[PDB]
Amino acid sequence: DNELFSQFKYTRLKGFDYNNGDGTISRRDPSRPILVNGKYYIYYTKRDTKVPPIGWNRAKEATDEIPSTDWDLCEIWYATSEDGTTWKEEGVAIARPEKPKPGWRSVATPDILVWKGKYYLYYQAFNEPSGLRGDWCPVSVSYADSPDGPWTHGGDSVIPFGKKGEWDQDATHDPQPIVYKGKIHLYYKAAYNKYAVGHGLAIADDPLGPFEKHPLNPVMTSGHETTYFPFKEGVATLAIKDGNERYTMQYAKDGVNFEIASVVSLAPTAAAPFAADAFTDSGNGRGVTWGLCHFTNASNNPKKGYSIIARFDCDLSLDVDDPFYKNTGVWHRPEVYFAQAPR
Amino acid sequence: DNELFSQFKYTRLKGFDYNNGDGTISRRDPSRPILVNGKYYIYYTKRDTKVPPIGWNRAKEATDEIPSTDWDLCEIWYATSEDGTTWKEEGVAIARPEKPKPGWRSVATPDILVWKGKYYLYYQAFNEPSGLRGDWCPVSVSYADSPDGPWTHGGDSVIPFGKKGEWDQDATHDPQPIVYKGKIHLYYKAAYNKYAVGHGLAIADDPLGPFEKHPLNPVMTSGHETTYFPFKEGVATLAIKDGNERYTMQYAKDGVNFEIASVVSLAPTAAAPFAADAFTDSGNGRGVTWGLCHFTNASNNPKKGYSIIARFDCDLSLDVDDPFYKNTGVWHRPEVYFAQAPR
Amino acid sequence: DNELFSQFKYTRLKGFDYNNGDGTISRRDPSRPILVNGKYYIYYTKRDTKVPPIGWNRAKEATDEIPSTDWDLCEIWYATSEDGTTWKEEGVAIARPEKPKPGWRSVATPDILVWKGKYYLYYQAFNEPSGLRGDWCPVSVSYADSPDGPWTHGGDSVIPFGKKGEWDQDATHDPQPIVYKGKIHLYYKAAYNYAVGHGLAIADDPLGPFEKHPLNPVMTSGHETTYFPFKEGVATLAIKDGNERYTMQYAKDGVNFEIASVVSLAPTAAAPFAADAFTDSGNGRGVTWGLCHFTNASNNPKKGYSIIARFDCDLSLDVDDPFYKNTGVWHRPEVYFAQAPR
Amino acid sequence: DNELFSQFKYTRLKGFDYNNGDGTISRRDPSRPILVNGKYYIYYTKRDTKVPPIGWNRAKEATDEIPSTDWDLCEIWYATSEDGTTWKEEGVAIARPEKPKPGWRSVATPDILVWKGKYYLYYQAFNEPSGLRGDWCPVSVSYADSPDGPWTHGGDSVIPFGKKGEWDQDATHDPQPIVYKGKIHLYYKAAYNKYAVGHGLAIADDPLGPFEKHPLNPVMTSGHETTYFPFKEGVATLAIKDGNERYTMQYAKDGVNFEIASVVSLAPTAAAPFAADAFTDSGNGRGVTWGLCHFTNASNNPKKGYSIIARFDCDLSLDVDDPFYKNTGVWHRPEVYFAQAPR
Ligand SMILES: [Ca+2]
Ligand SMILES: [Ca+2]
Ligand SMILES: [Ca+2]
Ligand SMILES: [Ca+2]
Ligand SMILES: [Ca+2]
Ligand SMILES: [Ca+2]
Ligand SMILES: [Ca+2]
Ligand SMILES: [Ca+2]
Ligand code: NA
């Protein structure tokens, strides 16, 4: 049967503290891990703030200490691990720059590119507390000679928005590049129109750009989030629609035209698969068995919101056939049901 | 928005003890509640045994004290409630009869009928430890003048099995009668053929039989279990496949030809909705907002397995419209994911 | 000259066809006759099948049409007679119920009770082909206002089995009721240990409940027995399969049986007529005739069937017939030549 | 598993005609076979008369041509066989002698002795139609060098009767000799007294006599008839009673004091086992597996009576163990029962 079908199993990470879950510390949107000198490295949004987020709808009340949303007032931090489950949080990778440089308010939602022996982080740059009035968080890039720092600012707004009226015109969220067909292929997302969510491709020969939009964008018309990895000579994705249990693996022979390969369930949010060959230009993608993800509803109390990062394992790999991941049913214990309570 | 689409929310019952979940006490397959004179009544399988079940596969080790399965060595008990959430367990309703009368080994999986001023319980009747040979638990019926006792035995094997080769040659599980078009409409189930589970219908004018099968059986061809209630001029049903996240409401203008009406999720197992008009012959079925259900994975430890009964609420009612139950998404908390661990 | 000693003489019945003995038709375990409106009535297992039994050993190959044993796929039929020798087979008395009601597969081995002017048939009820081989055939009861039926199902498993490990645990075969000390006294048999016991089960109501006599097994050997009221007690003929060892036994109180006589060539599945079987007279007069069967009617074991037959005797207080009181048996040479070498 | 316990199986003989069984030809009381020069030899009463016997109670009317009883007007004939089942009747062995020599009227009931290279026949010698009445048929002996003839008369009345009043005073029936402890041990029968049947022993060093009675006669006090063979260092015996199924195997360690060794059924009448060591003085008797016997009720009609000879087989041998002969049950077909008819 189907090489892009799998189940997902979850493991709590070791090594990250969250002030006992009081909403003042949050880690989310981890990057796909890379392996360098026998350590995995990951980069993620990290918030550490005096008070938990005050709410989108109250972005008015945010100050330089009080965040409006979970991703406001953040930096990008990084961690190393030998086995992918126990992590050591190392320190800041991307600090917010000085006001009013883009990002001065928050840098968030990173992903990694390895290119010609240097390391590049792409991430969203915020200039105002999120939720006022409408966003504008274009993508910045920084770079380094080492997976540890130090990191040097590279550019701001490095993915062009679209001309007025295009689907593309206000956003390039979640930048995520792979190396495909000898070029940097960077996927990203934008809500448009009853809003829908598109995914686009932007291509460059230079990590600092320029990046040019693919003429078929939006390459996908469905899916609140997606994550991509080289697979055979194409590109596979996991696609999620937020809140419903319709999750699909999709596959494009050309990295561009996507067709459903499988329907999966309980799939990770902000999934960040490890793939040895993400940046390798194989033409021969082997697929994946583990990576990181997040949960944004870590707290019970929505006035003390935070997120945590977590690990998933799966079998979406050509070099592994593990029937433990190939069952077709899901069984929840009664507590899961009692957590869906009446009013 | 669809009058047969709904979310399901769950409430822990009060009033039932399970010897701290050690596997010696189990309650499962509750009947649909009936309201008689300001009190709800339910009837349910109850096991209370010196030791937990030894296993299907070890049925040959079962004794008069050691059960093979969760439903072995059981009687049908009953309970009453004013509000449907706090219950008082009253005592036995159907005791196991003297060996070797059918049911002497276990009686289980009850459902209730109100007919011409009398109460009827239909249940499966076991003659040996379950799993020992091939099954064989035909349906018996007992009746009473009051929803309290006492119950008088009425008949054994009141639903006929099909001729050798036919789909229901071996079983009529989960008997569930409604009053429809002036007659007792008794739905039931049987596994056949990779094996499918059918549902059939049998009909009578005397609760004690004869029942005769209905052309078109199996009336459904899908779903490990189903529960039926009068809806408008027809009959609606919830249909569950064990293990997967895709459940459906289905509707049959005539009680026989059923078509999808909605797709739902996290739906209750062994659902037993209260419907004031279940037995009323009204031709105008109003739908349901609550009932009982069960969880057979109550224990963390499968060598000490037991089930509990629980309550669900929903809006599958024509007489109520509750936006709380009418969302389309489901959000689980991280512990739901961490309970799907790797090996 | 012992009133419970007798020889047995046999007469071929008239009236019953067996498809020329090809194994497809069989009749056996007849009920003790009763006399109602100047006719005798008997009830018996009847098989009428497309093919003879394939054997217990092959029960797995039995189907809806193919029987495993001689008593599989059977009904209880009945016949009437004026003289007890010429019979008219009348039709079905007990039909098999719809699957999966107990007995749907076969009903067999009936005996009759007359109680308060109604008629009761007790018989074994089978749910799967015999020899399959977890043998479970508890006793059902049906009743009628007339010996001619129609019959109404009265109850399944009306004689309780014993608790695990008791001799009684798995069977109540051959239920046979008499009326005794104003109660229904029902004798039945169970294999155990194999020994074969006979228990007594007592009731005030033919549909039950039946309670086991506190001292069962009441009798400890005899692969098969039959009972009639006698003086103030109960006499029995006790038979063992194969060996020609047969006893009449007697119990003052119907419970404690003592050997009264050794008899030979006794009838199998013996069903004597006793006008007082159900009369509660406390003065049992004993018997002179009845029905019996032979299970080895066919020369060929792949074409097995049984037939019903008549025996005559003097086991009566109202008759002293010396023709039945001789002590030797002489067989003609054919009988010897029928025990051939290999 | 008793060495003297056994079933008997019967075989119809080939070679003897009885005029379609019209009562005019009769063969009975065969001798134990002997094996000489690759052939078995038997000797037996043979009647061949113009009309059947008119009966004991009509002996007054018997003539030189009309016999009173089955054994009246007989001679002793002989037959040979290679297999024990197909026989060739060879001719007269003992002819009636000239009147009034004893036996002129009839010679009957023979048995054989092989002593010191010669063959001896003992048999009862009658002088008047049986039932005339007053039975007096003492035992004569004749001898030969070949089991074929010619035979020479040896003596009359060679077994002494008892003095008046002794159990023995009137008869020595069914003479049957064995060689035991270097001497001829000849068993015989006599009715005495409520009239019982004894069996006696008489001993001799010479086949022509004198024979001396055993002090303990009657050595056996039951049994209408008996037949004896060397068994171990004793003598075994089948004892028959007329009509009933009380047949016993008995054993006497010393050939004199007999004890019940088994109860058997359907045993042969006038049984005549072959025993290779009957005359061999072994002190080591092996027992028997086959022989001859008779049926005196060959005819359905008592006004046309005759007997026939037959073969039995059995396992009453120390040198054979045959479980076919070793079951304890007898099953008769229905016709056997219907032949016990009422009146
Ligand atoms: Ca991401
Ligand atoms: Ca794989
Ligand atoms: Ca149910
Ligand atoms: Ca509604
Ligand atoms: Ca009987
Ligand atoms: Ca008498
Ligand atoms: Ca002889
Ligand atoms: Ca032997
Ligand atoms: Na009916």
Contact D9 C339 (CB under 8 A): yes
**Buried b / exposed e along A110-143 (16+ C-beta atoms within 10 A):** bbbbbbeeebbbbbbbbbbbbbeeeeebbbbbbb
Residue A8: list chain B partners with CB under 8 A: 340
Residue-wise DSSP of D176-220: EEEEETTEEEEEEEEEE---EEEEEEEEESSTT---EE-TT--SB
* B84: alpha, beta or left? (left if phi > 0; alpha if psi -120 to 50): left
Structural contact between residues C29 and C269, judged by C-beta atoms closer than 8 angstroms: yes
CB neighbour list of residue A215: distance below 8 Å, 6 or more residues apart: none
- Quick one: tokens of D214? 């055993």
- Cβ contacts from A onto B, under 8 A: 99
Residue B305: list chain A partners with CB under 8 A: none
**Buried b / exposed e along D187-219 (16+ C-beta atoms within 10 A):** bbbbebeeeebbbbbbbbeebebebebeeebbb
- In CATH, C1-342 is 2.115.10.20: yes
Calculate Rg over the CA atoms of chain B: 19
User: Is B333 in the A-facing interface, judged by CB distances under 8 Å?
Assistant: yes
Which DSSP letter does residue D98 get? S
Helix ranges, chain D (H) = 334-338
Rounded to the nearest angstrom, the distance between the alpha carbon of B141 and the centre of ligand 9 is 13
Determine the residue among C28, C336, C342 to mutate to test chain D binding: the one whose Cβ has the most chain D Cβ atoms within 10 Å. Answer: C336
CA distance C191 to C171: 8
CB neighbour list of residue D181: distance below 8 Å, 6 or more residues apart: D255, D281, D283
Side chain identity, residue C107: V
Residue A7: list chain B partners with CB under 8 A: 340
Nearest CA in chain B to A7: B340
Helix ranges, chain A (H) = 334-339
User: Is C264 in the D-facing interface, judged by CB distances under 8 Å?
Assistant: yes
Side chain identity, residue B245: E
Cβ neighbourhood burial of C233 (10 Å; 0-12, 13-18, 19+):
middle
Residue C312: list chain D partners with CB under 8 A: 342
Angstrom distances, CA of residue B209 to CA of A272, B32, D318 = 62, 21, 69
Contact B340 A12 (CB under 8 A): no
Rounded to the nearest angstrom, the distance between the alpha carbon of A245 and the centre of ligand 3 is 27
CA distance B90 to B231: 32
Side chain identity, residue C43: Y
Residue B84: list chain A partners with CB under 8 A: none
- Look up the CATH number of domain B1-343: 2.115.10.20
Determine the residue among C157, C158, C163 to mutate to test chain B binding: the one whose Cβ has the most chain B Cβ atoms within 10 Å. Answer: C157
Question: Which residue from B133, B156, B160 is facing C134, i.e. has the nearest CB?
Answer: B133
| C340 to chain D, closest Cα gap in Å | 5
D90 marked as part of a ligand binding site: no
Cβ neighbourhood burial of C85 (10 Å; 0-12, 13-18, 19+):
middle
Q: What is the CA B315 to chain-centroid distance, rounded? A: 20
The three-state (H, E, C) secondary structure of A277-308, written as one string: CCCCCCCCEEEEEEEEEEECCCCCCHHHCCCE
Closest CA to D217 of D295, D291, D288, D163: D163
- Quick one: tokens of A18? 């969250």
Q: What is the CA B320 to chain-centroid distance, rounded? A: 25
Side chain identity, residue D82: E
Q: Are strands C233-239 and C224-231 parallel, antiparallel or unpaired?
A: antiparallel
Helix ranges, chain C (H) = 333-337
HSE (side-chain half, CA atoms, 13 Å) at A21: 11
Instruction: Write down which chains contact chain D via at least 3 CB pairs under 8 A.
Output: C
Rounded to the nearest angstrom, the distance between the alpha carbon of B7 and the centre of ligand 3 is 20
Q: Which ligand is nearest to the CA of A288?
A: 2
- Entry resolution in angstroms? 2.3
Structural contact between residues C121 and C31, judged by C-beta atoms closer than 8 angstroms: yes
The residue to which tokens 């006294």 are assigned = C185
Question: Which residue from B12, B244, B340 is facing A10, i.e. has the nearest CB?
Answer: B340
| B178 to chain A, closest Cα gap in Å | 28
Contact B310 A8 (CB under 8 A): no
Structural contact between residues A222 and A192, judged by C-beta atoms closer than 8 angstroms: no
CB neighbour list of residue C316: distance below 8 Å, 6 or more residues apart: C3, C285, C286, C287, C288
CA distance A340 to B333: 10
User: Is C312 in the D-facing interface, judged by CB distances under 8 Å?
Assistant: yes
Determine the residue among B6, B10, B262, B263 to mutate to test chain A binding: the one whose Cβ has the most chain A Cβ atoms within 10 Å. Answer: B10
Domain boundaries, chain C: 1-342
Collapsed DSSP state (helix, strand, coil) of residue B148? coil
